[PDB]
């Protein structure tokens, strides 16, 4: 069909931070359709990928990926905390990420 | 934070070895170190400590 999506759209908001100090080792993620910490429990442990493009082709591809995972909820509005193998770059604040349905408990 | 009651990292203040570099004196220390560890006799403990003393702390008899 016209749709082939098997992931849930997400946004990279910022790093974990206080008023004046940030922590790049943890990123805050907003998941579309999630507005409650109870609903965000469903996505705990799910894999996250950030997909971007580069001019140089390395392994027979010009598309690169950074992998992560959902660890815990954040606040009262459905935001979650995510950690990545390599920390996401700060220029991606406001960029789209993909939340996959695996590992699954259904 | 800990509200310490005593000074931290304080040395015992007692000599645990001779200050001398005498090779034969160190052999006597090694001999009585072994005896004090495996004889539980108060005499050996006293002798071992006495071998660490300085000159003014070992007046002639």
């Amino acid at each position: 069909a016209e749709s082939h999506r098997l992931y849930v759209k997400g946004k990279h908001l910022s790093y974990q931070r206080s008023k004046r100090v940030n922590n790049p080792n943890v990123s805050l993620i907003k998941i579309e359709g999630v507005a409650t910490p109870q609903d965000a429990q469903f996505y705990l442990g799910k894999r996250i990928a950030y997909v971007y493009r580069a001019s140089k082709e390395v392994r027979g591809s010009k598309i690169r990926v950074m992998w992560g995972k959902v660890t815990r909820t954040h606040g009262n509005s459905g935001v979650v905390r995510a950690t990545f193998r390599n920390n996401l770059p700060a220029k991606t604040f406001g960029a789209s990420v993909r939340i996959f349905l695996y590992p699954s408990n259904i | 934070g800990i509200d310490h009651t005593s000074k931290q990292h304080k040395r015992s203040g007692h000599r645990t070895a001779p200050k001398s570099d005498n090779v034969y004196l160190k052999l006597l220390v090694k001999l009585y170190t072994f005896l004090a560890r495996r004889t539980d006799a108060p005499f050996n403990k006293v002798v071992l400590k006495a071998l660490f003393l300085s000159k003014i702390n070992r007046p002639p008899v």
């Binding site: 749709s3 992931y7 849930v8 359709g33 609903d39 349905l101 590992p103 699954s104 408990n105 259904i106 | -």
Partner: protein, 156 residues
Amino acid sequence: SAQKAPKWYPSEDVAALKKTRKAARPQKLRASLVPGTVLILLAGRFRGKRVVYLKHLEDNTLLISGPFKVNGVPLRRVNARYVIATSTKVSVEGVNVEKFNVEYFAKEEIKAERVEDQKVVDKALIAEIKKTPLLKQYLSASFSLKNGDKPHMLKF
């Protein structure tokens, strides 16, 4: 001498490992995984396909069939954490799956025996699929997330 030799050298002998207390025990799958349950594949070459769960193998893998005649998915192994268990089920009584095991999928074109036993297993499944309307069409299609669909609220 450019460098003074050390007085002491470390031992060249490797030490034995301490006895471990970690006994392997069988995996228990989640209750939704029952033979005959229709599964949705989340990753791999056949992502989005709807297959039929047949047997649980000894390497903690799930044996599935498309059937190959319906959607082109052959007899394969899948990981339990990479599938979705749906609420629809097809009866498996009348399907022989005893011959398929871990060794049958040894890595070491398509072999003749794989073609033959694919037809044998699919024939029983296809007869059961024809019992209910639209099931054959349902297994031919692919699963996809649409706009506004929330997986934490959808029931499969």
